[PDB]
Structure formats: C-alpha cells, structure tokens
Amino acid sequence: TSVMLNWEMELKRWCPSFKILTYYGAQKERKLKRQGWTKPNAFHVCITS
DNA sequence: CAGGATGTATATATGTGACACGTGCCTGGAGACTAGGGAGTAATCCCCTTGGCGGTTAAAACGCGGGGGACAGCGCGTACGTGCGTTTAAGCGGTGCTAGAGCTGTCTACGACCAATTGAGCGGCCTCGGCACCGGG
Incomplete structure (x- = not known):
C-alpha cells in the first residue's frame, strides 16, 4: 500500500499510454470503480494492494 | 330545579331441596415385611465449543423539511331501542315403552418377555455441483 502511488507515478512518467486504474478506497468507491x-479496453494496468 | 314515574335494593319469612349425619359391608386399597434388581451418582479425563483480542466497513443515528395523516368539531340521516299488542311454543310433570350402557361370565388370540442372529442405520469422509455473489442491461 505504501508504493501504489509510486508505481502509478512511475507509470505516468515513463509509459504515458497505459490506462492506469488504482484500486483503492472504501467499499462503495471500490464498487463504483468496478x-x-x-x-474491453476499460483499463490497461490495474494497481492494487 | 324539581317530581311523577320506574327500577333496584334491602330485610324478613318459610318450607322443601340438599347438605349433613349415623349404621353396618366390604372390597378395593394402604401399608408392613423379606428378597432381588438396577440405574444414576461420583470421580477422572480427553476434547471441542465458548469467551476473549484488534480491524473493516455497514448499519444505526442525528438532523431537516414538508406532507399527508390523526384527531377534533359538526351535521345529516336512519336504525336501533323501547313500548304495546298479538301470537306462539317453551316450561311442567304425567304417563307409557323399549334400547342399549353396563355388569357379568367364559373362553382365547395377541403381545410382553427372553434369547440368539442379522443387516439398516448412522458416524465419517471425500468429491462435486447448486446456488451465493456479482457487475452490466
């Protein structure tokens, strides 16, 4: 959980073409994101804990 | 704010229904006395199912606003109550008759009971698939 933001920023920095989806937040927010x-093609890389 | 006009008590009385009280019967009970059985109390002890630690989100809770529902006032109508008269069958108790509930006597098939044998059921274990969960229409 401490490096989710780091991975997201590194992805946004080096490879800007990947659709990043950070799976975090309360249950309701997780359901909204799901x-x-x-x-298909909704997201390319998912980042979770 | 009275008073006929009913209705409801209150108190007294008596004699016929019913508690109340002998008189003896006895037969079903009630207890005493030996002998035999037996299941649960008591002490361990192995083993699951409670009661006790720290997080996560989901439901309880607090507030707000207005909206529709409760409750009160009021009035219209009719039907439900009360009284009077006519009618009917309900209460009484007197007589007649027999049907079967009940007591009784005899003979008997069914079930408790006891012992041996057998497989139906049940704890246990594992594999699996019907529905719990879920995210898009």
Whole structure:
C-alpha cells in the first residue's frame, strides 16, 4: 500500500499510454470503480494492494 | 330545579331441596415385611465449543423539511331501542315403552418377555455441483 502511488507515478512518467486504474478506497468507491470494469479496453494496468 | 314515574335494593319469612349425619359391608386399597434388581451418582479425563483480542466497513443515528395523516368539531340521516299488542311454543310433570350402557361370565388370540442372529442405520469422509455473489442491461 505504501508504493501504489509510486508505481502509478512511475507509470505516468515513463509509459504515458497505459490506462492506469488504482484500486483503492472504501467499499462503495471500490464498487463504483468496478462498475463497468469488465468491458474491453476499460483499463490497461490495474494497481492494487 | 324539581317530581311523577320506574327500577333496584334491602330485610324478613318459610318450607322443601340438599347438605349433613349415623349404621353396618366390604372390597378395593394402604401399608408392613423379606428378597432381588438396577440405574444414576461420583470421580477422572480427553476434547471441542465458548469467551476473549484488534480491524473493516455497514448499519444505526442525528438532523431537516414538508406532507399527508390523526384527531377534533359538526351535521345529516336512519336504525336501533323501547313500548304495546298479538301470537306462539317453551316450561311442567304425567304417563307409557323399549334400547342399549353396563355388569357379568367364559373362553382365547395377541403381545410382553427372553434369547440368539442379522443387516439398516448412522458416524465419517471425500468429491462435486447448486446456488451465493456479482457487475452490466
């Protein structure tokens, strides 16, 4: 959990073309983020703890 | 703010229903006295199912606002109560009759009971698939 932001920033820095999805927050926020996440090309790289 | 006009008590009385009280019967009970059985109390002790630690989010809670529901006032209508008269079958108790609940006597098939044998059921274990969970329409 301490390096999720670090990984996200490194991805945004080096490879700007990846759709990054940081899976964090309360349950309700996690459900909101999961809503429609099964669709194709919704995100390219997911970062979780 | 009275008073006929009812209705509801209150008190007394008596004699016929019913508690109340002998008189003896006895047969079903109630207890005493030996002998035999037996299941649960008591002490350990192995083993699960409680009661006790720290987090996570989900539900309880607090507030707000207005909206629809409770409760009170009021009035219209009709039906439900009360009284009077007519009607009916309900209460009484008197007689007649027999049907079967009950007591009784005899004979008997069914079940408790006891011993040996057998497999139906149940704890246990594992593999698996019906539905819990979930995110898009």
